[PDB]
Each structure stands twice: as C-alpha cells, then as structure tokens.
Coordinates of C-alpha atoms and ligand atoms in Angstrom, one line a residue:
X1 CA 0.1 5.9 24.4
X2 CA 2.1 4.0 21.7
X3 CA 5.1 4.9 19.6
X4 CA 3.5 3.4 16.5
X5 CA 0.4 5.5 16.9
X6 CA 2.6 8.7 17.0
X7 CA 4.8 7.6 14.1
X8 CA 4.7 8.8 10.6
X9 CA 5.6 6.1 8.1
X10 CA 7.2 6.3 4.6
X11 CA 6.9 3.5 2.1
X12 CA 9.8 2.7 -0.2
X13 CA 9.5 0.8 -3.4
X14 CA 13.2 -0.1 -3.6
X15 CA 13.2 -1.1 -7.3
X16 CA 12.4 2.6 -8.1
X17 CA 13.9 4.5 -5.2
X18 CA 17.6 4.9 -5.9
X19 CA 20.0 3.1 -8.2
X20 CA 23.6 3.3 -6.9
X21 CA 25.4 1.2 -9.5
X22 CA 24.1 2.2 -12.9
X23 CA 22.2 -1.0 -13.8
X24 CA 18.8 0.8 -13.8
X25 CA 17.5 -1.0 -10.7
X26 CA 17.1 0.7 -7.4
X27 CA 19.0 -1.0 -4.6
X28 CA 19.8 -1.0 -0.9
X29 CA 22.9 1.2 -1.1
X30 CA 20.7 3.6 -3.0
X31 CA 18.3 3.7 0.0
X32 CA 21.2 4.2 2.4
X33 CA 22.4 7.2 0.3
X34 CA 19.0 9.0 0.8
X35 CA 18.4 8.3 4.5
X36 CA 19.3 12.1 5.1
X37 CA 16.2 12.9 3.0
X38 CA 13.9 10.7 5.1
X39 CA 15.5 12.0 8.3
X40 CA 15.0 15.6 7.2
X41 CA 11.4 14.9 6.2
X42 CA 10.7 13.8 9.7
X43 CA 9.9 10.1 9.1
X44 CA 9.7 7.8 12.1
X45 CA 9.1 4.3 10.4
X46 CA 10.3 3.1 7.0
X47 CA 8.3 0.2 5.4
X48 CA 10.4 -1.2 2.6
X49 CA 8.8 -3.4 0.0
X50 CA 10.1 -7.0 -0.5
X51 CA 13.9 -7.2 -0.8
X52 CA 14.2 -11.0 -0.6
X53 CA 15.5 -13.4 -3.2
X54 CA 13.0 -13.4 -6.0
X55 CA 12.7 -14.2 -9.8
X56 CA 10.7 -10.9 -9.7
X57 CA 7.7 -12.1 -11.7
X58 CA 5.8 -9.8 -9.2
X59 CA 8.7 -7.6 -8.3
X60 CA 9.7 -9.2 -5.0
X61 CA 6.3 -10.6 -3.9
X62 CA 7.3 -13.9 -5.4
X63 CA 9.9 -15.0 -2.9
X64 CA 12.3 -17.9 -3.5
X65 CA 14.4 -17.6 -0.3
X66 CA 12.9 -15.7 2.7
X67 CA 16.4 -15.5 4.4
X68 CA 18.5 -14.0 1.6
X69 CA 18.5 -10.6 0.0
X70 CA 17.5 -10.2 -3.6
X71 CA 20.7 -10.0 -5.7
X72 CA 19.4 -6.9 -7.6
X73 CA 19.3 -5.0 -4.4
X74 CA 22.5 -6.2 -2.7
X75 CA 23.5 -8.6 0.0
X76 CA 22.7 -9.3 3.6
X77 CA 25.7 -7.1 4.5
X78 CA 24.0 -4.2 2.7
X79 CA 20.8 -4.9 4.6
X80 CA 22.7 -5.0 7.9
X81 CA 24.1 -1.6 7.0
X82 CA 20.7 -0.2 6.1
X83 CA 19.2 -1.3 9.4
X84 CA 22.2 0.0 11.4
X85 CA 22.0 3.4 9.6
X86 CA 18.2 3.6 10.1
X87 CA 18.5 2.8 13.8
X88 CA 21.4 5.3 14.4
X89 CA 19.2 8.0 12.8
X90 CA 16.5 7.3 15.4
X91 CA 14.2 5.7 12.7
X92 CA 12.7 2.3 12.6
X93 CA 12.2 -0.2 9.7
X94 CA 9.4 -2.6 9.0
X95 CA 9.7 -5.4 6.4
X96 CA 7.2 -6.7 3.9
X97 CA 6.0 -10.2 5.2
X98 CA 4.7 -12.2 2.2
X99 CA 3.4 -15.6 3.4
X100 CA 0.2 -16.2 1.5
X101 CA 2.3 -17.6 -1.4
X102 CA 6.0 -18.2 -2.5
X103 CA 7.7 -18.2 -5.8
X104 CA 7.4 -21.3 -7.9
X105 CA 11.2 -21.4 -7.7
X106 CA 11.1 -21.6 -3.9
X107 CA 12.7 -24.9 -2.8
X108 CA 9.5 -25.9 -1.0
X109 CA 7.6 -25.7 -4.3
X110 CA 10.3 -27.4 -6.4
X111 CA 9.9 -30.3 -4.0
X112 CA 6.1 -30.0 -3.8
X113 CA 5.7 -30.1 -7.6
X114 CA 8.0 -33.1 -8.2
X115 CA 5.7 -35.9 -7.0
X116 CA 2.4 -36.5 -5.3
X117 CA 4.3 -38.5 -2.6
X118 CA 6.9 -35.8 -2.0
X119 CA 6.9 -34.7 1.7
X120 CA 6.4 -31.0 0.5
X121 CA 3.4 -31.8 -1.7
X122 CA 0.9 -30.5 0.9
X123 CA 2.9 -27.3 1.5
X124 CA 0.8 -26.0 -1.4
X125 CA -2.7 -26.3 -2.8
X126 CA -3.1 -29.2 -5.3
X127 CA -6.2 -30.6 -6.8
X128 CA -7.2 -32.8 -9.8
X129 CA -9.0 -31.1 -12.6
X130 CA -12.8 -31.3 -13.2
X131 CA -14.4 -32.5 -16.4
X132 CA -11.1 -32.0 -18.3
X133 CA -10.6 -28.5 -17.1
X134 CA -9.5 -26.7 -13.9
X135 CA -10.8 -27.7 -10.5
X136 CA -13.2 -24.8 -10.5
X137 CA -14.0 -21.5 -12.3
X138 CA -12.0 -19.1 -10.1
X139 CA -10.1 -16.3 -11.7
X140 CA -6.7 -15.1 -10.6
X141 CA -6.5 -11.5 -9.3
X142 CA -3.9 -11.1 -12.1
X143 CA -6.4 -12.5 -14.8
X144 CA -6.8 -15.9 -16.2
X145 CA -7.3 -19.1 -14.2
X146 CA -6.5 -19.3 -10.5
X147 CA -5.2 -22.8 -11.3
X148 CA -2.0 -23.9 -13.3
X149 CA -1.7 -27.4 -14.5
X150 CA 1.4 -29.5 -13.7
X151 CA 2.0 -31.9 -16.5
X152 CA 4.3 -34.1 -14.5
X153 CA 2.0 -34.9 -11.6
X154 CA -1.2 -34.3 -13.6
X155 CA -2.8 -31.9 -11.0
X156 CA -3.3 -28.2 -10.8
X157 CA -1.9 -25.9 -8.2
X158 CA -3.7 -22.8 -7.0
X159 CA -2.4 -19.3 -7.5
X160 CA -4.5 -16.3 -6.4
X161 CA -1.8 -14.1 -7.9
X162 CA 0.6 -14.9 -10.7
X163 CA 1.3 -18.4 -12.2
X164 CA 4.7 -18.1 -10.5
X165 CA 3.1 -17.4 -7.1
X166 CA 1.7 -20.7 -5.8
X167 CA -0.4 -20.3 -2.7
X168 CA 0.8 -21.8 0.5
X169 CA -1.4 -24.4 2.2
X170 CA -2.1 -22.8 5.7
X171 CA -4.2 -25.9 6.6
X172 CA -0.8 -27.8 6.9
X173 CA 0.7 -27.6 10.4
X174 CA 4.2 -28.1 9.0
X175 CA 3.9 -25.1 6.7
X176 CA 2.7 -22.9 9.5
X177 CA 5.6 -24.0 11.7
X178 CA 8.2 -23.2 9.1
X179 CA 6.7 -19.8 8.4
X180 CA 6.7 -18.9 12.1
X181 CA 10.3 -19.9 12.4
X182 CA 11.2 -17.6 9.5
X183 CA 9.2 -14.7 10.9
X184 CA 11.0 -15.0 14.2
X185 CA 14.4 -15.3 12.5
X186 CA 13.8 -11.8 11.0
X187 CA 12.4 -10.4 14.3
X188 CA 15.5 -11.6 16.1
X189 CA 17.6 -9.4 13.9
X190 CA 15.9 -6.3 15.5
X191 CA 13.7 -5.1 12.7
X192 CA 10.8 -3.1 14.1
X193 CA 7.8 -5.1 12.6
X194 CA 6.1 -6.0 9.4
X195 CA 3.6 -4.9 6.8
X196 CA 1.8 -8.2 6.2
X197 CA 1.0 -8.9 2.5
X198 CA -2.2 -10.3 1.2
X199 CA -2.9 -11.7 4.7
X200 CA -6.7 -11.8 4.1
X201 CA -6.2 -14.6 1.4
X202 CA -4.7 -17.4 3.6
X203 CA -8.1 -19.2 4.2
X204 CA -9.6 -20.9 1.2
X205 CA -13.2 -22.2 1.3
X206 CA -12.9 -26.0 1.7
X207 CA -13.6 -27.9 -1.4
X208 CA -13.1 -24.8 -3.5
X209 CA -16.6 -24.6 -4.8
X210 CA -17.4 -22.9 -8.1
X211 CA -18.8 -19.4 -8.0
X212 CA -21.8 -18.1 -10.0
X213 CA -21.0 -17.6 -13.7
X214 CA -24.3 -16.4 -15.3
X215 CA -22.4 -14.5 -18.0
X216 CA -20.5 -17.7 -19.0
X217 CA -17.1 -15.9 -18.6
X218 CA -13.9 -17.9 -19.0
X219 CA -13.3 -17.5 -15.2
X220 CA -15.0 -15.4 -12.4
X221 CA -13.6 -13.1 -9.8
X222 CA -12.9 -15.4 -6.8
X223 CA -12.7 -13.2 -3.6
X224 CA -15.7 -15.1 -2.2
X225 CA -13.5 -18.2 -2.3
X226 CA -10.4 -16.9 -0.5
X227 CA -10.7 -13.2 0.8
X228 CA -11.3 -13.1 4.6
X229 CA -13.0 -16.4 4.8
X230 CA -14.4 -18.1 7.9
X231 CA -11.7 -20.0 9.7
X232 CA -9.0 -17.3 8.9
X233 CA -9.0 -16.0 12.6
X234 CA -7.7 -19.3 13.9
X235 CA -4.6 -18.9 11.7
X236 CA -4.1 -15.2 12.4
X237 CA -4.4 -15.7 16.2
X238 CA -1.9 -18.4 16.0
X239 CA 0.5 -16.3 13.9
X240 CA 0.3 -13.5 16.5
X241 CA 0.8 -15.8 19.5
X242 CA 3.8 -17.7 17.9
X243 CA 5.5 -14.6 16.5
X244 CA 4.5 -10.9 16.8
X245 CA 3.4 -11.1 20.5
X246 CA 7.0 -12.0 21.5
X247 CA 8.4 -8.7 20.3
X248 CA 8.0 -5.0 20.8
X249 CA 7.1 -4.3 17.2
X250 CA 4.4 -2.8 14.9
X251 CA 2.3 -4.8 12.5
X252 CA 0.0 -3.4 9.8
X253 CA -1.9 -6.2 7.9
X254 CA -3.0 -5.6 4.3
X255 CA -6.4 -7.0 4.8
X256 CA -9.1 -6.8 2.0
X257 CA -12.6 -7.9 2.8
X258 CA -12.7 -6.3 6.3
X259 CA -15.4 -3.7 6.9
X260 CA -15.4 -0.8 9.4
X261 CA -17.9 -2.5 11.7
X262 CA -16.3 -5.9 11.6
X263 CA -12.7 -5.0 12.3
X264 CA -12.5 -5.9 16.0
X265 CA -10.7 -9.2 15.5
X266 CA -8.1 -7.4 13.2
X267 CA -7.1 -4.3 15.1
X268 CA -8.8 -4.1 18.5
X269 CA -6.3 -3.2 21.3
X270 CA -7.7 -6.1 23.2
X271 CA -7.1 -9.2 21.1
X272 CA -6.6 -7.9 17.6
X273 CA -4.4 -9.7 15.1
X274 CA -2.4 -6.5 14.2
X275 CA -1.9 -3.0 15.4
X276 CA -3.6 -1.6 12.3
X277 CA -4.7 -2.7 8.8
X278 CA -4.7 -1.3 5.3
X279 CA -8.3 -1.4 4.1
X280 CA -9.3 -0.6 0.5
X281 CA -12.8 0.9 0.6
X282 CA -11.7 4.4 -0.2
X283 CA -9.6 3.2 -3.1
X284 CA -12.6 1.8 -5.1
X285 CA -14.5 5.0 -6.0
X286 CA -14.5 4.8 -9.8
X287 CA -17.0 6.9 -11.9
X288 CA -18.0 12.5 -13.2
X289 CA -16.5 14.5 -10.4
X290 CA -15.3 12.5 -7.4
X291 CA -18.2 11.6 -5.2
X292 CA -16.9 13.6 -2.2
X293 CA -19.7 12.5 0.2
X294 CA -19.1 8.9 -0.4
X295 CA -15.4 9.4 0.4
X296 CA -16.5 11.2 3.6
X297 CA -18.8 8.3 4.5
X298 CA -16.1 5.7 4.0
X299 CA -13.4 7.4 5.9
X300 CA -15.7 8.6 8.7
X301 CA -17.0 5.0 9.1
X302 CA -13.5 3.8 9.8
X303 CA -12.7 6.7 12.1
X304 CA -15.8 6.1 14.2
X305 CA -15.8 2.4 13.8
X306 CA -12.2 1.8 15.2
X307 CA -12.7 4.5 17.8
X308 CA -15.6 2.4 19.3
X309 CA -13.4 -0.7 19.6
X310 CA -10.1 1.0 20.6
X311 CA -8.6 0.1 17.3
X312 CA -6.2 2.3 15.2
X313 CA -6.4 3.4 11.5
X314 CA -3.6 3.1 9.0
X315 CA -4.0 6.3 7.0
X316 CA -3.0 6.4 3.3
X317 CA -3.9 7.5 -0.2
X318 CA -1.0 5.9 -2.2
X319 CA 1.0 2.7 -2.4
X320 CA 2.7 0.5 -5.0
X321 CA -0.7 -1.0 -5.9
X322 CA -2.6 2.2 -6.8
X323 CA -2.4 5.1 -9.3
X324 CA -1.1 8.5 -8.0
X325 CA -3.5 10.3 -5.7
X326 CA -3.4 13.7 -7.5
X327 CA -5.0 11.7 -10.3
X328 CA -7.3 9.5 -8.2
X329 CA -8.6 12.1 -5.8
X330 CA -7.2 15.5 -6.8
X331 CA -6.7 17.4 -10.2
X332 CA -3.8 17.6 -12.6
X333 CA -5.1 21.1 -13.4
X334 CA -4.3 22.0 -9.8
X335 CA -1.4 19.5 -9.1
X336 CA 0.4 21.4 -6.3
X337 CA -2.8 22.8 -4.7
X338 CA -4.7 19.4 -4.7
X339 CA -1.6 17.5 -3.7
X340 CA -1.4 19.7 -0.5
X341 CA -5.2 19.6 0.0
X342 CA -5.2 15.8 -0.1
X343 CA -2.2 15.7 2.2
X344 CA -3.9 17.8 4.9
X345 CA -7.1 15.7 4.4
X346 CA -5.9 12.2 4.9
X347 CA -2.8 12.9 7.1
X348 CA -4.6 14.6 10.0
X349 CA -7.3 12.1 10.6
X350 CA -6.8 9.9 13.6
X351 CA -4.4 7.1 12.9
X352 CA -0.9 6.4 11.6
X353 CA -0.2 8.2 8.3
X354 CA 1.8 6.5 5.5
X355 CA 3.6 8.5 2.8
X356 CA 4.4 6.6 -0.4
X357 CA 7.6 7.6 -2.3
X358 CA 6.8 10.6 -4.5
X359 CA 3.5 11.4 -2.9
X360 CA 5.3 14.1 -1.0
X361 CA 6.3 15.7 -4.3
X362 CA 2.9 15.6 -6.0
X363 CA 4.1 13.0 -8.5
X364 CA 1.4 12.1 -11.1
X365 CA 0.4 9.3 -13.4
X366 CA 2.5 8.5 -16.6
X367 CA 1.3 7.6 -20.0
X368 CA 3.7 5.5 -22.0
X369 CA 2.7 4.8 -25.6
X370 CA 3.9 1.2 -25.8
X371 CA 2.8 -1.8 -23.9
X372 CA 6.5 -2.8 -23.9
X373 CA 7.2 0.2 -21.6
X374 CA 5.0 -1.4 -18.9
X375 CA 6.1 -4.2 -16.5
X376 CA 3.2 -5.0 -14.0
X377 CA 2.6 -8.8 -14.4
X378 CA -1.1 -8.2 -13.6
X379 CA -1.6 -5.7 -16.5
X380 CA 0.6 -7.6 -18.9
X381 CA -1.4 -10.7 -18.3
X382 CA -4.6 -8.7 -18.6
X383 CA -3.3 -7.4 -22.0
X384 CA -2.6 -10.8 -23.2
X385 CA -5.8 -12.4 -22.0
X386 CA -8.1 -9.6 -23.3
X387 CA -6.2 -9.2 -26.6
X388 CA -6.7 -13.0 -27.1
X389 CA -10.5 -12.3 -26.6
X390 CA -10.6 -9.6 -29.1
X391 CA -10.3 -6.5 -27.1
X392 CA -8.5 -3.9 -29.1
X393 CA -5.1 -2.6 -28.2
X394 CA -6.6 0.9 -27.5
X395 CA -9.3 -0.3 -25.2
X396 CA -6.7 -2.3 -23.2
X397 CA -4.3 0.6 -23.0
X398 CA -7.0 2.8 -21.6
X399 CA -7.5 0.5 -18.6
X400 CA -3.7 0.3 -18.0
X401 CA -3.2 4.1 -18.3
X402 CA -6.2 5.0 -16.1
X403 CA -6.0 2.1 -13.4
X404 CA -2.5 0.4 -13.7
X405 CA -0.3 0.5 -10.5
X406 CA 2.8 1.0 -12.7
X407 CA 1.7 4.6 -12.5
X408 CA 3.2 4.5 -8.9
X409 CA 6.4 2.5 -9.9
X410 CA 8.2 5.0 -12.0
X411 CA 11.6 6.2 -10.7
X412 CA 11.7 8.6 -7.8
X413 CA 12.4 12.1 -9.1
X414 CA 15.4 13.5 -7.3
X415 CA 16.6 16.2 -9.6
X416 CA 16.6 17.3 -13.2
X417 CA 19.7 15.3 -14.2
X418 CA 19.4 12.2 -16.5
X419 CA 16.7 9.8 -15.3
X420 CA 15.9 12.5 -12.6
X421 CA 19.0 11.4 -10.9
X422 CA 17.6 8.0 -10.0
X423 CA 20.2 6.2 -12.1
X424 CA 23.2 6.8 -14.4
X425 CA 22.0 3.9 -16.6
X426 CA 18.8 2.7 -18.2
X427 CA 16.0 2.6 -15.6
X428 CA 14.1 -0.6 -15.4
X429 CA 11.0 1.5 -15.9
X430 CA 11.2 4.8 -17.6
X431 CA 11.1 8.0 -15.6
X432 CA 8.0 10.2 -15.9
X433 CA 8.9 13.0 -18.3
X434 CA 7.5 15.6 -15.8
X435 CA 10.6 15.2 -13.6
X436 CA 11.9 18.4 -15.3
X437 CA 9.1 20.1 -13.3
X438 CA 8.6 17.8 -10.2
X439 CA 11.7 16.8 -8.3
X440 CA 13.1 16.8 -4.8
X441 CA 15.9 19.3 -5.5
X442 CA 13.5 22.0 -6.9
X443 CA 11.1 21.4 -4.0
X444 CA 13.6 21.6 -1.2
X445 CA 14.5 25.2 -2.0
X446 CA 10.9 26.3 -2.8
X447 CA 9.1 27.3 0.4
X448 CA 5.7 26.7 -1.4
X449 CA 6.6 23.2 -2.5
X450 CA 4.5 20.0 -1.9
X451 CA 7.5 18.6 -0.1
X452 CA 7.8 21.4 2.4
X453 CA 4.0 21.2 3.0
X454 CA 4.4 17.6 4.0
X455 CA 7.4 18.6 6.2
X456 CA 5.1 21.1 8.0
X457 CA 2.3 18.5 8.3
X458 CA 4.7 16.1 10.0
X459 CA 5.9 18.8 12.3
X460 CA 2.5 20.1 13.4
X461 CA 1.3 16.5 14.0
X462 CA 4.4 15.9 16.2
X463 CA 4.0 19.2 18.2
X464 CA 0.2 19.0 18.9
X465 CA -1.1 16.0 20.7
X466 CA -4.7 16.7 19.5
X467 CA -3.5 15.8 16.0
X468 CA -2.3 12.3 17.3
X469 CA -4.9 11.4 19.9
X470 CA -7.8 13.8 19.4
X471 CA -11.3 12.4 18.6
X472 CA -12.4 12.8 15.0
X473 CA -15.8 14.3 14.1
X474 CA -17.1 15.1 10.6
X475 CA -18.4 18.6 9.9
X476 CA -20.7 19.8 7.2
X477 CA -21.5 16.3 6.0
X478 CA -23.9 17.3 3.2
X479 CA -21.4 19.8 1.6
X480 CA -20.5 18.3 -1.8
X481 CA -17.3 20.4 -2.1
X482 CA -15.9 20.9 1.4
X483 CA -14.5 18.1 3.4
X484 CA -14.2 19.4 7.0
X485 CA -13.6 17.7 10.3
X486 CA -12.3 18.3 13.8
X487 CA -9.9 16.7 16.2
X488 CA -10.6 17.2 19.8
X489 CA -8.4 16.5 22.9
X490 CA -9.2 18.3 26.3
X491 CA -9.1 22.0 25.7
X492 CA -7.8 21.9 22.1
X493 CA -9.8 21.6 18.8
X494 CA -8.1 21.3 15.5
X495 CA -10.3 22.2 12.5
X496 CA -9.2 20.8 9.1
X497 CA -10.9 22.4 6.1
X498 CA -10.3 21.0 2.6
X499 CA -12.1 22.5 -0.5
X500 CA -12.0 19.3 -2.5
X501 CA -13.3 20.9 -5.7
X502 CA -11.8 22.8 -8.7
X503 CA -13.8 25.8 -7.9
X504 CA -13.8 28.7 -5.5
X505 CA -16.2 27.9 -2.6
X506 CA -17.5 29.7 0.5
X507 CA -17.6 27.9 3.8
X508 CA -18.9 29.1 7.2
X509 CA -16.4 28.5 10.0
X510 CA -18.0 26.1 12.6
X511 CA -19.2 28.1 15.6
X512 CA -12.8 29.7 21.7
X513 CA -10.3 31.9 23.6
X514 CA -7.6 31.6 20.9
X515 CA -7.2 30.7 17.3
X516 CA -4.0 29.9 15.3
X517 CA -3.5 28.8 11.7
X518 CA -1.2 25.7 11.7
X519 CA -0.9 25.3 7.9
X520 CA -2.4 26.6 4.7
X521 CA -1.7 26.1 1.0
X522 CA -2.8 29.5 -0.2
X523 CA -1.7 33.0 0.8
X524 CA -4.1 34.4 3.5
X525 CA -6.3 37.3 2.7
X526 CA -6.0 40.1 5.3
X527 CA -9.6 41.3 4.6
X528 CA -11.0 37.8 4.9
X529 CA -13.4 37.2 7.8
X530 CA -12.9 33.9 9.7
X531 CA -16.7 33.5 9.8
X532 CA -17.1 33.4 6.0
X533 CA -14.2 31.5 4.4
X534 CA -13.7 32.2 0.7
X535 CA -11.7 29.1 -0.4
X536 CA -9.8 28.8 -3.6
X537 CA -9.7 25.5 -5.6
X538 CA -8.3 22.8 -3.4
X539 CA -7.5 25.3 -0.7
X540 CA -6.9 23.7 2.7
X541 CA -6.4 25.3 6.1
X542 CA -5.8 23.8 9.5
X543 CA -6.8 25.9 12.6
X544 CA -6.0 25.3 16.2
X545 CA -8.6 26.5 18.8
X546 CA -8.1 26.7 22.5
Ligands
LIG601 O1 1.8 -10.5 -3.3 C1 0.7 -10.4 -4.3 C2 0.1 -9.0 -4.2 O2 -0.3 -8.8 -2.9 C3 -0.6 -7.5 -2.5 O3 -1.8 -6.9 -3.2 C4 -3.0 -7.6 -3.4 C5 -4.0 -7.7 -2.2 O4 -3.4 -8.4 -1.1 C6 -5.3 -8.3 -2.7 O5 -6.3 -8.3 -1.6 C7 -5.8 -7.7 -3.9 O6 -6.2 -6.3 -3.7 C8 -7.5 -6.2 -4.2 C9 -8.5 -5.9 -3.1 O7 -8.8 -7.0 -2.4 C10 -9.8 -5.2 -3.7 O8 -10.6 -4.7 -2.6 C11 -9.4 -4.1 -4.7 O9 -8.6 -3.1 -4.1 O10 -8.8 -4.7 -5.8 C12 -7.5 -5.3 -5.5 C13 -7.3 -6.2 -6.8 O11 -6.0 -6.1 -7.2 O12 -4.8 -7.7 -4.9 C14 -3.7 -6.9 -4.6 C15 -2.7 -6.9 -5.8 O13 -3.5 -6.5 -6.9 C16 0.6 -6.7 -2.7 O14 0.4 -5.4 -2.1 C17 0.8 -6.6 -4.2 O15 1.9 -5.7 -4.6 C18 1.2 -8.0 -4.7 O16 1.3 -8.0 -6.1
CA602 CA1 21.3 -0.8 -9.0
CA603 CA1 -10.3 34.0 0.1

C-alpha cells in the first residue's frame, strides 16, 4: 500500500563510509563509488547522515549553512551527482534534517549572540542567570550544563547537545518560517524525504523550571524539561502542513519520549506527524544474560500498538548513536551466527527495516587504548567532566568502551588492504583491527557470510507479501531463550524462530498444506523432525506455511 512500507533502508555515516581522496575522511565521491554495492545488496532507500557545512563539533549535526555541502565531503555538484546516480539506479535518498539546533557558527547565531537588541536574538534560547549561576540545573545530553554563558551580552544560551549546538527557539514564528523555507528548498531538489533529528526536543517547558536534585549533583538529566513536552504537537503539525505534506516523500522522526500506546499523533496514517519514528525503548536494556523476555515485550508492544492505530514501525538495531548489535544483543563468541540471528529477528517484523553500515558484515565494537583515539564530543566531554570530579581514567574508559557510539563510527571494512580499503591515507578514526577477518570482499565470495544472509533476507521480504504486510503475533512468550513470532496474510503464515541464547535449545514447532524454509543460518539436519526443533546457539530459521 506504500512504497516506503515495502522499502529496505540503508544508513550511511559518510565520514566513515569511503574516502576517495586520501585525507582520511569519507566523502560523497566515495559514496558514489560504492553505489553498486548498495544496489547489489537490494537497498531501496539510502539515509545519509548530515552532509551540510559544519564545524563538525558533533560530526555534521552542528550545521552552519543548511544550503551548502560540508567541505570535507565535497560540493553541491558532488551531491547533485550522488542524487542523480542514486535515482538512475532506482534507489531513493533521504537527508538528515537537523532543526532542533544549529552550529554556534551559523550566521543566525553569530547575529543572535552579538546583542540583546539584534533582530536574531530570539532565534535562540537566551536567559539571565540565577543566583550567580545558570538559569537552572539542567544537564546537557553531552554532560555538563545545558547553558553556556555569553560574556558579551551577559546571558546564557541553552544547548541540549554540545556547547557549539545552541537550540533554536521554536516559539519564534520567524524561526519556524525560515526553517520551513529551507526544508522546502531541499525538497524542491527532488530528494525523497528526511530522517528528522532530535525532533522530540523542540518544545521546552516554559520558564525552564529546575528539576529535582536530591543527590546535589552539579546538574541533573533534563529530559523532563525538553523531551516530548506538551505543546510540541502544535509545532510538528505545522511543520508537516507547511513542508512534508506538499511532497510525495517519506519521513522518519527520531523521537525519544514516545511510548507504544501514545504514538498516534506521531505515526498514525490518519493525521500522524511522520510516516514512522525511531523509538529507543529496545536500546536501553543494560544489565547478566540479555533479558530476552523484556526485549520481546518492548518490540511486541510496538508491533501491536502501531497495528491498532494504522501506524508503521521503523525497524532497527544499529545506528551512529549506538554500539554494535552483535555486542549489544548477540555474542562475540558467536559473531557470525548471532549477527544472522539478530538480522532475521529484527528485519522480519512488520515495519520498514533499516540497515546501518557494517551491520550487514557483523562488524563489532572496538577497544582503543587511548582517549586520544576517540572523537565523540559526548564521550570526550564526559571524560573531561568526570575526570575533573575524580573519576579515574580506567573507570571512564570502561563507560566509553562499553557504551560509546564511536563503536559504530570506525571505517567501513571493504577489504584487507590498508585501512580496510576505506582510505589510502590516515583515517579520521582508526579502523577496527578485525577488518582482516571482517570485510566486504571476503563476505561477497563466501556463501555463508553475514552479507549474503542479509542479501537473502532482503530478497525473501521482497518476494513474499506476508513479510511486508502480514500481521505480527508473538509465540512462546515465556521462553527465555527462543524469540519466535509469526507473520500472517490471507493463506500464508511466516514463522520466524530465533534461538537468542549461546546454548543448544529444543523448541516445539507451533501446531498447513505446504511448508518451505526461506532462510537458515545453520546446515539443516536431515534426521531432524519439524515438530521438535533442535536449535544450535543463535540458530535462526524462517518457515513459510500455506
Ligand atoms: O544532533 C544532536 C544529536 O541528536 C541525535 O541524537 C540524540 C537524540 O535526539 C536524543 O533524544 C538523545 O537520545 C537519548 C534518548 O532520548 C534516550 O532515550 C536514550 O536513548 O539516551 C539517549 C541519550 O544520548 O541523544 C541523542 C544523541 O546522544 C543524533 O542522532 C545524534 O547523532 C546527534 O549527536
Ligand atoms: Ca576524503
Ligand atoms: Ca539440530
């Protein structure tokens, strides 16, 4: 019923995808050079992370010119070539729309900060201090205060994210008008839509009241002051009417603070802000084995919850903000098996699946010895803030190694040449040493590779409508090792069975005129009875019943 429901999306982090000119930084001509790879994978939609002019304090999410390409990545002519090549391959491109905040080097902010009476002052969020300190006790998501003092005008500006990412004032009609014009300027070029960044953060609680601080911390996590706050829907409804609704595009909103039963306004077919949202509930399961049943509960709540409102799920396990999914949800002791198990698990639920670069190879976390090898502004600021407070170097590195999103930002691993073929120079972030084992070139020619498993997943989803539009139903809910579910559409039922445990397990097949195995990550045992499945660690199978 919709092209974006049937699509499989691939997410490119361009700084780490392909360097075409030896400076160690991925670029647009690098992306163009690998479009055959994404075509051959079977990708329908490419989401490219921000490629706009940026000082790169937050690697593109701090934008200083919305209408110019980041110099590191190329020019508008390179972008025009990329879009032309993508569209001639029958693929689509969505851009990363970043309008909660700008760079502090954006011309609007350079005007805004210059004087209280500057006409751009109210484009951002300014407030006098309180009792000689910040206007309130809110913490930035990147640690430290959510307020930065301006010596010249003697006021603080708010930044939910880095000090170089001042938040835009969405209560200002002039701001909204300029943002809508710029969105439509991009849409007029014929891009196919947007992933909408941090979009849950655009409504701040008026008066910015202090939050509880019983532990007398320096600052306190401030989501209750700015994540999905009452009043946000007025802005998002206007954004949709003034921009997205005028074009045949897809939108996926990155929307924290939305629950599976309160998602109508965000994604309902009748009146939702977006076609689909990224929600974070399944990415917050920290400890000793993974709580499989809590994962079932979360994902099933979203399957059932959006089915009731005619919404649509964005399916994912990886992106540029998370650690690698083999680490987070699988096992490094069963890297290939668990990568495939996880793939079948998340990809075949009802929704639009996203593949993050390297996920299709089973890429895993890195451990660099030195803080100087890392880049993430959030984790570097965390280091500095916590080191100042007396946290030891080793305690801080443990947090960065186990939770830091730099784990997903190491160069894409193309082959076993220098830098895994990502660059002829010195990569901006070092390649994971396991590229000698994990790389596209080796996986292409190995029928058993993670890459070719993803290829077959994409193919079976395209060829069987039940895997796109079939109703989801959780099976065997209480089983602490097996995640199993069905997809049903008329006379076809797909059964997805995943042994999400590092042990052998036995599972009773749910009890058709015909049965077919669509995909499997272990050799099939001829003597095995369908009724009593003897599953190996992280074994997955997908059956098709008529
Ligand atoms: O452009 C700044 C930043 O924005 C994007 O990521 C941010 C999310 O928008 C924001 O909601 C927050 O995510 C947190 C979730 O709300 C919370 O449920 C849980 O998942 O912890 C997260 C805290 O970090 O913060 C992220 C960034 O950390 C964008 O995708 C980022 O790349 C970008 O840096
Ligand atoms: Ca380059
Ligand atoms: Ca067996």
